[PDB]
Amino acid sequence: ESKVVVPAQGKKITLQNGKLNVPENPIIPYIEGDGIGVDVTPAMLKVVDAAVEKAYKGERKISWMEIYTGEKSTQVYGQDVWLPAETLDLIREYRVAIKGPLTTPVGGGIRSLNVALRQELDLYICLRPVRYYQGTPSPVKHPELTDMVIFRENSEDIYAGIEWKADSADAEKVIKFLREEMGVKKIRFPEHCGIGIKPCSEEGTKRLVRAAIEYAIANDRDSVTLVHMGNIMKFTEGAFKDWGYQLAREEFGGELIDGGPWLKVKNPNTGKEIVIKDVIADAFLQQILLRPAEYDVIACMNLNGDYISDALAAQVGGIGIAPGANIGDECALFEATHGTAPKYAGQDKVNPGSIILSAEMMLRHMGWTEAADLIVKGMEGAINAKTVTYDFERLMDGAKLLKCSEFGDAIIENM
Amino acid sequence: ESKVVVPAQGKKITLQNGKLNVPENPIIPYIEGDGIGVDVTPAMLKVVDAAVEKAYKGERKISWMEIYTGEKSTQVYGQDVWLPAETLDLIREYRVAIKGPLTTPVGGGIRSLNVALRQELDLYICLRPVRYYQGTPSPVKHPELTDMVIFRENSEDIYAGIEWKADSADAEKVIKFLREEMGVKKIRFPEHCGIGIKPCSEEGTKRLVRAAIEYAIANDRDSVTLVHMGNIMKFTEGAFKDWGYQLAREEFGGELIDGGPWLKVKNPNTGKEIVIKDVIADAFLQQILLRPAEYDVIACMNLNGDYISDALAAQVGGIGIAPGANIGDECALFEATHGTAPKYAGQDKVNPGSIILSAEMMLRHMGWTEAADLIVKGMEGAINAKTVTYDFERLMDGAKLLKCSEFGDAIIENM
Ligand SMILES: [Mn+2]
Numbered sequence A, B: 001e002s003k004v005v006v007p008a009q010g011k012k013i014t015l016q017n018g019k020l021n022v023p024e025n026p027i028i029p030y031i032e033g034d035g036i037g038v039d040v041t042p043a044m045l046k047v048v049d050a051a052v053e054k055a056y057k058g059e060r061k062i063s064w065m066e067i068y069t070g071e072k073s074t075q076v077y078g079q080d081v082w083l084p085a086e087t088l089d090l091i092r093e094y095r096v097a098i099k100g101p102l103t104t105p106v107g108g109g110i111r112s113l114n115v116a117l118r119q120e121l122d123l124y125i126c127l128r129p130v131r132y133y134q135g136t137p138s139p140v141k142h143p144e145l146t147d148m149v150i151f152r153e154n155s156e157d158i159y160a161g162i163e164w165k166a167d168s169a170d171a172e173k174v175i176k177f178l179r180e181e182m183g184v185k186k187i188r189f190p191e192h193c194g195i196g197i198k199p200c201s202e203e204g205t206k207r208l209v210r211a212a213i214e215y216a217i218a219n220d221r222d223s224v225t226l227v228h229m230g231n232i233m234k235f236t237e238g239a240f241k242d243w244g245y246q247l248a249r250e251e252f253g254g255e256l257i258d259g260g261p262w263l264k265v266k267n268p269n270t271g272k273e274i275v276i277k278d279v280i281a282d283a284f285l286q287q288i289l290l291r292p293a294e295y296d297v298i299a300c301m302n303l304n305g306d307y308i309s310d311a312l313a314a315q316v317g318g319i320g321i322a323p324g325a326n327i328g329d330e331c332a333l334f335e336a337t338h339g340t341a342p343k344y345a346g347q348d349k350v351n352p353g354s355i356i357l358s359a360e361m362m363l364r365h366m367g368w369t370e371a372a373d374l375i376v377k378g379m380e381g382a383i384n385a386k387t388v389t390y391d392f393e394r395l396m397d398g399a400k401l402l403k404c405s406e407f408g409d410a411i412i413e414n415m
């Protein structure tokens, strides 16, 4: 029987015509998360509650409902229950949910639980905004020049988990097929060879890029850059770029800039000309360091997005405070983006900034922009006040060391 | 008939027992390169000649022999001759060669010429050393902490170029096979879907990692880090890491550090304990910025190596002066690692540092360490003297702007 307790006081969020109908007392499911999730989640719940209390003068209140996935799920539901069917059901049912870090066990043949949540709920958009918070210790000279929003495709690519082990009957069957029926000659060593499949479809590309352009319009952003490796992988990465440009022309009236290949899309609300461009992935990894100001909204495939989001997060000193969301047409799951750091679990020491900023993305998604704005204001003030957790403090002079919970308070104090 | 002219005075380098037998007058084939290759190559030839002249007091001299590939090949041999069979023959025959930037035409279905050279000559090692040259304008606060050597697998991965276009009969045939015969259920959108194959074999992994460990030993380096995405791609990326560790244990007497997974390999020459470790690729992209000093020799797959080498190059202000080599068991091809920058072609303006440093790797490979040391010394002095090309000068105050050829001279002047 389920151990999830539906809050007595609280109402389910609904969806109509692609628009969320959020009540003043929405029930929001939440997954504590493994390791440090035990530290960061409580801080997040408190910070969010303070923000909504302050924003709406007590008129609104979230009814938190704990659901399970990861190590805590096995302890709650038993041995092999890492991701209960009900968790997928609950998230879809309640439309909006948030979670702490999740880790996948090894030795049992289980694949990434985070990817499982994304794929099964068809949360095709991995949204990762990366900006700099003044006062954050950064390894680069000008982190303030970074203000990007990453739209990472979440349902395709080699991330789909389609592969076969070297020397397995399956791997041999696939390789035999490729060489004998497809006439593949480029497999250098066909024996003791593992094989992986990289898919990229038009509908997959289009829906991701459509969300990216709509975001640029809704937020009056300057450009959308399609990042890819089309010079090497023409039919997957290259096709992604092609379809992205095509979508811009076919659905957003994209016009040609100069002699190409860049396009301009008129923002139907502000009249601003949004530039649609593209950059090779490896070169992009260099450009984000050398010319970050030239970039804004980014649309890319799964793997590249993973790399880009992490590299960007590192550069602005936000490795531990990078917010993230997994969005689909029916529901959305916000999440801490860092690891579980089991060594510090329960020490009330780690930075709760990632899950908190992911909660602010959640609040904004719910249309509760005022509360979200309060969290941003709180984070900015606390960091600028140099009252921070160890991960920041260690790289600074004259900073006040704060525990995880205390930093949560500092955020509230700066709202 | 061939238009390649074998130098009258000069002798072919030979190979015996995996050791190059280099004469005092070796014939070295060279490809000018497209675009700025017309600017950088002449500077390289002059710098190298000055270095060997100075090092061996006139006793040794390279007999340069021009060979063709790229745009110049079509102009020399005709319309469809982008990569002549003789070029592959010449490189293998003469054992050591160098080249400027190469570009691949689009619209003709031709795949990367650089990859073609690597694959066809089985140059399985893409060696990319990245260090900081004092005085180089860098976007990071402490670029001097970066001193890494990248061993990028060059014959496998999605880089192999195995893929099929969306809606093509082939793509449909492969997808049908995967779904109906392999029972694949993770292809989100099977229609209008491009497909790519990612292979990774044991022999491919082992030979790359073997070269990496041997390099760490020969150069008394501190560690070898296997970079991979094994948490997501278990059978390719994960297998690479597994085989890498296995090779360390089976061939280099690797012993377990603590409770694992790190290993220690005793340097048979210095007694130094070389640490063998591994890091997830996305996290590595962050670690190179946050903790670069903890890394040294890196061994990774094709695509990841491409990303890692570029990101590292950018961080140390070496985007345009990053040396590179493609090494195999029978021959080696050194190359400029940047693009062709056609806009500046013939202006004697671009930085010849990349091809020059690649020539120093070439000289060292030939056993001409003294000449190679002279080039390093020259580069260090010129950069530190702030007498540089526009790409550096633009990011500095109080620097003396030098043309491409003039920077070549500056290098010579600092030998
Ligand atoms: Mn990640």
Ligand SMILES: [Mn+2]
Residues within 6 Å of the ligand: A282, B306, B310
């Ligand atoms: Mn490259």
